[model samples]
Target chain A: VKEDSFCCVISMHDGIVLYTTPSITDVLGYPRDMWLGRSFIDFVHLKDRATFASQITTGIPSTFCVMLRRYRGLKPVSYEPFRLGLTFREAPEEARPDNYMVSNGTNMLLVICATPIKSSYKVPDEILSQKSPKFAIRHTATGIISHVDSAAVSALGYLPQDLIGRSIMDFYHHEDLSVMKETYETVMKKGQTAGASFCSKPYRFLIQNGCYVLLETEWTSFVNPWSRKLEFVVGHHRVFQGPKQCNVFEAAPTCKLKISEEAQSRNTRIKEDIVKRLAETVSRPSDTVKQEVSRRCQALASFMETLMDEVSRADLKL
Target chain B: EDSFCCVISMHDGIVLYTTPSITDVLGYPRDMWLGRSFIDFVHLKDRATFASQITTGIAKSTFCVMLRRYRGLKSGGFGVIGRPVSYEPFRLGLTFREAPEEARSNGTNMLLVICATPIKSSYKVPDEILSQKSPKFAIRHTATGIISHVDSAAVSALGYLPQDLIGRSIMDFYHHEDLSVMKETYETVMKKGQTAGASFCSKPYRFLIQNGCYVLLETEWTSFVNPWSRKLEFVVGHHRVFQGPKQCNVFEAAPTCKLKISEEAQSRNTRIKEDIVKRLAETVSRPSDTVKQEVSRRCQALASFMETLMDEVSRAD
Candidate 1:
């Protein structure tokens, strides 16, 4: 199952084993019957094991003492590049690999090998890059936009040639201009964050191409690193790329938590009443359908009143 | 090609031919039906209307008709005995036979047979056929309320014999306590055009098919063409049908789906946390009081958020 593109190997400390290579199967391809009873670092390049063995005598887990060397070659090669400097001895018998004695009385070293495996979905670079897409934005102490990255240029579909000197507000959709202005003023003046997020109708930027690019952005306040008192407004835009495309609209980080609690309490009371009412209504069907309708209307009216009361009390509005 | 199956008789109601597809569908050789009376193949209950339509030459106009028919294999006794056979209604046509001008005029005796079963329209066969034949169930839409569809497996899952529900309206199978949700879901589906599914826990249905019975189902409906006539027909399909006493938690049962949205949110949070931690680790100073306070606030907010989610889970029951 070994392939040329990648390999996997294990690196072991006394307490833990770390996967040091991309492939894992070449060394321990069997369990219990084959390679199960062996240590993970047994396969490290042979010349390096002496350094590791000497370090093991120090009995310190946190110290960086392990040095592995490849045993298959004597001098530096292209694929396994090498550099040589000082050799140490007499620092401590436990610290000097060149002076240690092995069980077989032969020079012992570490064996580090590349191990490969099959049947895996290698994450493509584009997706990996998108997962951590660069977000380089600079804001003035008073929350004014000062700079953005080239990645944002591609994200907003603008050529860097055209974006250097424009105001951040220039990209805000007309309908959101008032809210954008309010958010900026509020964050700067109050030194607090204030905003609303709606994914369905996102901010649209009119690029030079004449087509509009939709963006879901949050406006928040942040203090400038250089100025202690000056606060600047920052807009963090999340660009969504999914089948049913929409920016991920996170609930208000704090307020939503409170409202959800109230919603839960209200739902519980309503459910109990609804269940009781249903049982009462179903138990007695001899009443005229008109009577039943009137009773149901009363129950529905109560339900609506409670729902409206709960919605009105929800305090996420700016 | 295996999908094609049709049979037709002469205008006089005498079987003139059965396509080779007859064996594929009804397990009968074409030759076996060539001279038989067409009405004899129809179930006894459907024979009268079947014969009348053929005799009156009105069968052509009828796009589709269910034949409560029985099929018999060429080698043995009746296959799938006494089951209703849905078929494509065919049209009558005139044909001119060769040879004698005055002998056995062929124009009036010709007919066209078209099998309407195995409908080609994607929307016609309830999606249950595409996914699996779950039972008739209900789904609620935010705008349209609730709607029902045949979810075959749901009946079996709910501990009721499938036959007991084959033709019953689903409203009869819903717990009275859940009727409001059912009504709401119906309205939501009608208004929104589609709905997410709703489930129920071990509760009471007035009919009471089984004790401690509970069910979960997912259903979707669409407008389809009635295969034979190519006319508008309403079609509903069930996507999932699950049930059991142990699986009957009202909250979980109501929406028989496990989207793991919280896990997704947590993963995103972890990514953001890693980014923040990396930046913090590089900085020489410990975060200022202000930054620490903000982090504490966010942490408290997250704790309360989780508490609320737990309540919502409880309320769903």
Candidate 2:
């Protein structure tokens, strides 16, 4: 590791900071003396403690990640900290022999520094062109990784580290599981690459916490460096544009069906009310009474006819 | 038995009598008929025939003529023929047509006629004497003539019992003595089967008390009907009666308030229907994949158009 590469190791079980690279002082405004043997949560922003702890313990074996807003010091300048994808297991003999240590030898965690790298692509002259979309790397499978961006983050609320080692299946809508599997195989195994086409079919991404966000996206795939195997996924998230009418895609199927059924029931009620009023009016004798009844009857009938016409218009648009 | 009925004269043609067989036919004793009139049991329709028959028979000098049974005395009655036994006494032999032929063979077949024409010279009796027993004197008419029924309350109001006025002409009660309003009301009721309503009052006549001075009497009449038998009936006079006034009660019309309420209900229903239709339309008009593609294409077109505009402006500058 470079001397300036800021790093920290944590005990997976107890969250004790076991090690820190020399650049800890420059990165977190803390000297090495204050860094080691202290809780890693001490440097973490207080609100991110739970996220940090969860990642250390249960999230080790899985590729899980989250972004943290970290304050460096008195200055307001901060960093978007990406927790490196790593896990803990039994330590080696040289590192173990912690019969006296409460954590059964220092449980370990790995972290990676995520400073931005300069790009070779020249910036265009226009203000819009000067801006480059941000991106993130995600693990399509246990060790397979690729980059994503704000478009994907918006569709699936995850940061780089949390998404880097988890199975992509974790984010697919349940009914689309087979489509995802088949599509993944075709792109990865058959080597039949699809174009920059959007997935018109709606999908939902299940977050690590088991909640979902409906998303419309386009995807492609390539071989990954970490796994040394073919990998397929949605292209860089920057390229995917969400549906213009978000409501249409986000609505639950059952919810739309229920609205349709209720409309039909209201239509039936109006028809019945119209007929009942008309029959009552027709049976009257006196001119005054007849006129009153007739007026009411016609009013009700008019309303029913209008409703029926509206329903017909609705059908035509289909 | 042969003197079961009688006939009398008034103004030489007016006849008034009660069949003495009222005891045998109607369950009343014979003497009960002494001051009663024959027209008392005559249906309102036959009253004039009995009167005309008496006048014609008297003019023909057949003062005690006998005719066939004109009507039943009361219960279980039908008309049958008999003979008059006395013309001067104005009497008759009333018998059934079905009497045994053997009774005809005997002098018993004489069937006993009692005649008393001028027997009493009662026809020209003094007004004072007539007034004393005038309770039984009244007029009757045929079905063709006007007939009206009056209740007991009307009789009592006139200082007379119900029977005292039974056969009286209603014309005598009309307040306008010269005008024949009674006849008009009767004719309408007979033809139309009913008149809406009519009223009358008795003549300011007199009652001769023991002192022989006339006591003035006044009465009023109102109309009614016996629904069950379709006969003339009367309500108690001087009282109001109504038929189904609640159904026709005309409160002032409030059409505007009713119309406003109707319009409000209609608009509310329309609003609800419109909301439902919009929701259904949204559901039905759900965008297809092609719509999404079209939207994306339009977005791209917009972006390119902006780019072209920007480039053209920059070049001009």
Candidate 3:
């Protein structure tokens, strides 16, 4: 079941294994389930635990020498030296999204990739580039472009004035247009507070140079609640620059981690909650509802009587 | 595109491409302020805050400046188009989303420069959090139970240092029996919820207080739809302790969730420490599709600053 055993995506919270890559079994020779709910210290050698404690002290990224204990069967005892790099996860920052003071809990962020490295193992830092391919598209909250930056002239292959005062709906790729509506409705439902910005699953935009250009977009709106007036709706759009969108995520050979008991419980729980809700709200089956209330409890006594007896008496052992 | 602030894409706080809006807003001659230090425009009292913000790699959040002004409508102008006041502060938000160091300009002025955009300070916490008697705090976490940021209230109420609870799993503090309750309450919350005050009060369950003792607490869970990510980012809890236990009798109970820490040690738990405060943060961070926007924002923000440093280096050279 192990894929790219070279790298395993593992998650931890306060030193305990909350979730881990099942491929860890491939690297460390321990079943995935064994790691869950166990302390990271449990797998560390007595000597390395002291240093392991030091590397994790801050959110800054740092590399550490982690000696892991592999499967041992009264064999030679040796701590396998593994390299671990920890960084503050690029997870959600706005934990408390609204004004309310409530704390259900928050997530911990530390990403550790398994094993020793190959040459040049670095992720491309794409977003922070200054003067990147992104162009600015400004519109009213109603989807009409009020101001189109001159950069869009070369970027969109259209004059800035030509797109101005026109509806953004006019330039959308047909099938892709509908995908944006739900997100719009959702943001409005959440209440458009001042400076509320949102990102979307980029919908393909109809462009002049080519047929379709998928827009990598981020949006922010300015409104003064006291005045009930909208200042502007700004959109950051990054147009696909090359001749064709080159395939990304390839060269990354397969064999990534899978089969999460964490995902499974949530997946399985979704149906249980859904069906329970459905059953709880279902219409009564008996038409004689007025007279049938007590009648249904008739077999309920039998169910109560037979349940303990069946498990107690079923002798068919498999 | 519209960096609502009047700015000069400054390199070393020197105006590179000063936008014209600064003249209209601040009542100064755009040409006069051009090529000078951007800091010359701020009030003396606010200079320190502005000082930190004017450096090459500015903050993600915006900083407000009270530029020395009232050039008096250039001494003329109309209708509040000009009806505005000189007291209106200029809030600057910086980003490096402009030109990269690679295209550092051959012969012209598309030259790489640091940028400051005008960002509206949208959200901040309520004072009632720290201004209270019963020590109120909020724990912001993911859909699952890992802890991120904790409020100071944890110290007074649970005797937990914010660091003690931050980066730890909320599950580590829960009674094993109440884990069942955690699932149900969270389930109910997603399918339903609270806004101002907690509409759902958890059945008074005892939570681990730092003195190695457990005190009864009922957390009020609230869900927040992250503005940038546009997903259900956090499920927060506001804490309240019970004086007399009977105040919670109206809530329903499950038979399995009742337990004492001492009983737990003698029975189910063996290896867990009495306090999880000393545990280290996670060894790895996992990707969750839900925070796609947050991830995107970070990348964009980073690329901006990376461009900033690169631009400064090129400018220096």
Candidate 4:
């Protein structure tokens, strides 16, 4: 826990602040004594009381964000004291809860920890905004179009509606149908692994004008954020015929199922650059981040342990 | 039917009920978000901002906080300012406040999220391959034609970057009398559908067309010199059918699927719009001041516009 990350044990039944960290002086400047023996409600702003109370009574580990009042340098100050996160969990049976109030005739206690909330939405650079590329999201199992980014119009005149009820195979070149079939099986066979994507050899895919586009595609896999299953296949497409340029990955130096050796070198080459720019961003989690959240979650659990022990030894009579 | 906005009701974060258009607006299948946490779909940076916005104002007053999507930023949205934050699915601030008015039968606590606009659907990401054959450039401006967004293809197709065209009234770029063709197209679209930003093609206008699509300059069209570069450029007016991106084409044959969901996202969007307007009317009894007037005006705009959209869709089918 960072220095301002305060821990406390509160009376779950009546909302009493039974124990609190001395570090509270750094954040709210209230010093340790003022927090103890006071109802937690005393420090909450008038408007936040009802909200804080409702979340506290849920009887399980629950996280919430609310503003609390504080004292600093003999003046009243109110900041979002825990603009970070504050979570409350019920004290375990092993911890002492002998004197705390009971809810529903069950004896219990609650502990909480304050953690930071990082404001990470950066103003997008002009280049990144321009780099918004075209791709269509397809069902991994069925190869049907779930969503086509608005950018897909340049590749095919297909309105999201035209593509909506169908799959690429319906409109891909009849001769290269097996090629895409090869593309599909290759990707699915690539299985549920990170960075798993399949690149197809140049093939003809039909366009909105009812003509064929000399197309190449890179189908990258993603677990559905909602489904937690390998449900999405995001296909990046390039039309190869003209004086046009595209993402370097979809360009000629890019490799295909044509050669494993070519694929390994060229694939990693493009991956490193794109991932380099990508690593340079994301308020969202990347595959490589951890410990901060892991430890914060750990803090919630550990704080509950200390909360139980503190309640067991406390001399307060409330 | 016009689905300019979609609404959902989630409790703290869990989904309670969402009008079907959410699938269209957010690009997730209905099954994907049915009972999930709204936090799961919100952009990571906005998660805490949202939680606190909904919490502190709960059971007391009301306010607004943005609900940006997990990824994909389009042209521009009401976010970032008022709070112009970049958003996937186009971030529009969610108004999750205390229910000043509404029924309370069982008295559940759910957030009534409104105005998930398909705000930035006009621009295309740049494509080099499509420059030769694509031949079309799309720009979105106000009804009066102040360009707000231009597709990347404009870079190659129209001999202009988005910067060159954006912020200028399109009238200056096109022939003076193109306004006649534009007004005619606009009127024709209004007569045919009476919609906002309805689609119509221009008759070989040297420059801009009307709303719903950008000016397309097919080969051997017209040419003019740029005031900035003094270089001769050619552009011909063209049009393509554009429906704002929202509503789903749900993949079929799920054991969990509902038949109503498979229907065109159009009608579902209309039905949802009607329900939303009715709820706004329900919540209006909390009356007085700017909010009351503002909320009532929204219902008015939504309902009347909805009728025009319904007429357009019914005739369109």
Per-prediction fnat: 0.00, 0.00, 0.01, 0.00
RMSD of 1: 31.9
In model 2 chain A, where is the ten-residue run with the lowest total lDDT?
Answer: A277-286
Regions of candidate 1 where Cα sits further than 4 Å from its true position: A1-318, B1-7, B44-108, B116-170, B173-180, B187-317
RMSD of each: 31.9, 48.9, 30.7, 32.8
TM-score for each predicted model, relative to the true structure: 0.21, 0.22, 0.29, 0.22
- The lDDT values for all models are 0.34, 0.35, 0.47, 0.42
Query: For residues B194-300, could you state the per-residue lDDT of candidate 3 as single tens digits?
Result: 23123456776667655444556757766543211223445678776543122122111213334466765644443332222112111123233434444575687
lDDT of 1 by residue, A29-90 (tens): 32221222224344433544444444432331122212222223233511121111212112
Output the better candidate (2/3) by lDDT. 3
Candidate 2, superposed: residue stretches over 4 Å from native: A1-4, A59-79, A87-90, A94-237, A240-318, B1-317
Which candidate leads in lDDT?
3
Give the candidate number with the greatest TM-score: 3
Chain A TM-score for model 2, please? 0.36
Whichever of 1 and 3 has more lDDT, that candidate is 3
C-alpha lDDT (0 to 100) for residue B300 of candidate 4: 76
